[PDB]
Amino acid sequence: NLDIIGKRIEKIKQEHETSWHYDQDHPYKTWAYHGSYETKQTSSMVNGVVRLLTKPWDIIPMVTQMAMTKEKVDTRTQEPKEGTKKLMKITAEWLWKELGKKKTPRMCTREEFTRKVRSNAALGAIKWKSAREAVEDSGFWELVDKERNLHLEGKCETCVYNMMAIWYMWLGARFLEFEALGFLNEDHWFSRENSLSGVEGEGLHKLGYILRDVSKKEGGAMYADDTAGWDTRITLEDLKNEEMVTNHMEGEHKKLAEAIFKLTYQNKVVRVQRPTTVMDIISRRDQRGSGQVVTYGLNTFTNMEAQLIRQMEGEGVFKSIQHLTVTEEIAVKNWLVRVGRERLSRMAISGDDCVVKPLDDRFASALTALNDMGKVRKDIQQWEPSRGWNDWTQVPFCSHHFHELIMKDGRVLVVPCRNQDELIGRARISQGAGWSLRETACLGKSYAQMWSLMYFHRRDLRLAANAICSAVPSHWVPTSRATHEWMTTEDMLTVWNRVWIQENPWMEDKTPVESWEEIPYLGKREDQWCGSLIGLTSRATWAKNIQTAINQVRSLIGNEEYTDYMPSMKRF
Ligand SMILES: C[C@H](N)c1ccc(NC(=O)C2CC2)cc1
Ligand SMILES: [Cl-]
Ligand SMILES: [Zn+2]
Ligand SMILES: [Zn+2]
Structure with a gap:
């Protein structure tokens, strides 16, 4: 609580000391509310070249409506049962080891980050106007150094989310996240060759061939359950299982990576504009709050974990999620060591999005661990069995x-x-x-x-x-x-x-x-x-x-x- 977020909160109050009001009609029940200040500020345009050359579509409502133009973020997932927590910790440990077998964690550099902004990538940032200017400027980097030394101390000052749901940070905080965790994307940890279930960097011209290769395995139907708002269903338990990547790290990197997980992920701070315009400073310890690129890699990791556990439940590796026996822990470990890699190869996973070809169709009704991890399926009753696909050419994946x-x-x-x-x-x-x-x-x-x-x-x-x-x-x-x-x-x-x-x-x-x-x-x-x-x-x-x-x-x-x-x- 306030020991970790106070400095960030205290800092913000002082910059708007001539506005601070602790409003008592604040719409927050889940989010912790701290205060508000005075603010006043804020769409898709049509491409005329594409439209003039696609005239028949001027009268198709599905085309034309796409160009015109909540109560999910303000929710909290329950604490999983103790047997669920053990399944997740054991699986996460084994999966980081497997991903780390042929990769070395490493810091990403200012040079790498500078080249990234000069080439324009969606980094989701906010003294300088463009991010290109700051990369060229040199005081910004002294600002980065200050925060960096703060992170080494175990404290944070300027690593604050702005909701608009996409959570932008100032470019400096993005640098520090990229320095610590950029290796996951930059060195292709979720490639198919290294992760087996992953598809990072594969391309739309490869995805179809990858689904067809999964189809070739002996098993039951292909399952493609979407989660109802995946980012909102990320537990503190999931954040802590993701943090175990720091166990593969060393020196400074380890401290810097521990700090991002502890300070910016496991204990967040957000500024949200409320029209009644006022800026509410709220906080929470759970849900997905990172950069869109680190979000992708960690969503992939936690999805791989959840899907291996759903597979375990379908194969009857464990009986109950309420409590795990010492023999059942042994069986989960022996399964991962004996078939873990084979079971990863039976999946295609892209962030929150998955296709699984399990060993057989008991997977369709293996719902207890999945529901208890809080990964509740979209558009189907909580305890209704999954409808699988019999034809790989029917399976939906990555919007295709x-x-x-x-x-x-x-x-x-x-x-x-x-x-x-x-x-x-x-x-x-x-x-x-x-x-x-x-x-x-x-x-x-x-x-x-x-x-x-x-x-x-x-x-x-x-x-x-x-x-x-x-x-x-x-x-x-x-x-x-x-x-x-x-x-x-x-x-x-x-x-x-x-x-x-x-x-x-x-x-x-x-x-x-x-x-x-x-x-x-x-x-x-x-x-x-x-x-x-x-x-x-x-x-x-x-x-x-x-x-x-x-x-x-x-x-x-x-x-x-x-x-x-x-x-x-x-x-x-
Ligand atoms: C070979 C070239 N790709 C092409 C061009 C037009 C058609 N359109 C139809 O056949 C519509 C009348 C039913 C098909 C192929
Ligand atoms: Cl089908
Ligand atoms: Zn910070
Ligand atoms: Zn088609």
């Missing part, structure tokens, strides 16, 4: 399903897919404003090249992608604000051959493809089923008159070097 698509030469593509309304509606939105015509065009080109690489097998996206790349100057570089092989000025057929043939470990014959017409689509009915507008009069007019749309956008951007990509299609 995967099709098996056979090339005219017999080689097999496993391709990612989702409702086409979702793909078109996302490409039509630009995050933040201040965008030039050129920047908006380069974002449209990023979507177009992504569609050519991942969604080529959809007829409407190949056409629209060719149109947008025809409408945007040939040499303009794609921008943004997975592995992203579409972010390049190289020829998109050359990248396709590299990603789908040369570098594709499931493709034995490495014969290059010479043209886009060699590259197949879904079935006409599978395409429409997935949402193609084909067969519609509004769509055929768009395909027929596409050069007119292209020319409208060329006229707006002006007199530039353009390429006609439309003849890559045999029809044009």
Whole structure:
């Protein structure tokens, strides 16, 4: 409590000593409330290039509504039973060891962090305006040093969350989290090769092949239960099991990592704007409050742990979660040592998102440990058995399903897919404003090249992608604000051959493809089923008159070097 958070709280009061009021109509029951001060401050814009080249979608409500525009955060998960706590501690210990077998924890550097902000990544930050300026500035780094020495002392002053649910910190606090825990992401601890259940850095062009490899194992159905608000269901017990990564560390790193876990995770402080505008300073010891990248890695870890325990329950490794016997602890340990790795290989896990192919379908009704860890399944009654999938091409994972698509030469593509309304509606939105015509065009080109690489097998996206790349100057570089092989000025057929043939470990014959017409689509009915507008009069007019749309956008951007990509299609 206040011994660890006082300094942060005390500091904030003093900066707004001419506003501090301890309001008694504060909406908080779970969150600890400390005080309030005076504040007054705060949407998605449409990409006109993508929209002008996707006119049929102007009348599809699923597309157009995506561009318009709580009581989950203010909740508390109960303390798990003692047998649940033991299962979790034993499993967490074994899993950190397995992840650490071929990796060395290590500090991440200012140089690494500096290069990260100069290249623009979503670091979620807030004397300086841009984070680029601070990295260049040198007082900021003295500010970092002060906090750093404070962390070594066992104290914290400026590591405070701002809710808006995404929790931004000042860039200095992000540095210190990245210094301590950045190795998890930077050194690929959750790669499939090192974690077995993981998919970090794999790419959407690999996920479908990975699900198909899981399908090949003997077992029962494939289960893909989503958790109801995963971040809100992270217990202090989960935070303490995650902290055990510091047991693999040494020297300063160990102290710095212990400090982030103790001070910024296990005992948080947040400033939330309440319109009644006032800034409430509240605190809590549980729930997920980190950086989006460390959040990913620790969500993956705790999800792997929860799913191995659910598997153990389905195999009857333990009887009851209320209490674990000394023989049952022995059995859990022997299971992990004898089949732990095999059971990890039966899963694909990406943060909160999982697919499990258990040994058999007893897993479907193995609910006691899962419910008691507080990982309550979304949209199903607490004690109703999971509905599993019998076909790997039906299984949802990372917002996608995967099709098996056979090339005219017999080689097999496993391709990612989702409702086409979702793909078109996302490409039509630009995050933040201040965008030039050129920047908006380069974002449209990023979507177009992504569609050519991942969604080529959809007829409407190949056409629209060719149109947008025809409408945007040939040499303009794609921008943004997975592995992203579409972010390049190289020829998109050359990248396709590299990603789908040369570098594709499931493709034995490495014969290059010479043209886009060699590259197949879904079935006409599978395409429409997935949402193609084909067969519609509004769509055929768009395909027929596409050069007119292209020319409208060329006229707006002006007199530039353009390429006609439309003849890559045999029809044009
Ligand atoms: C080969 C090229 N990808 C292409 C172009 C248009 C269609 N559209 C249909 O077949 C609609 C009428 C039912 C199919 C394929
Ligand atoms: Cl199915
Ligand atoms: Zn701090
Ligand atoms: Zn599909």
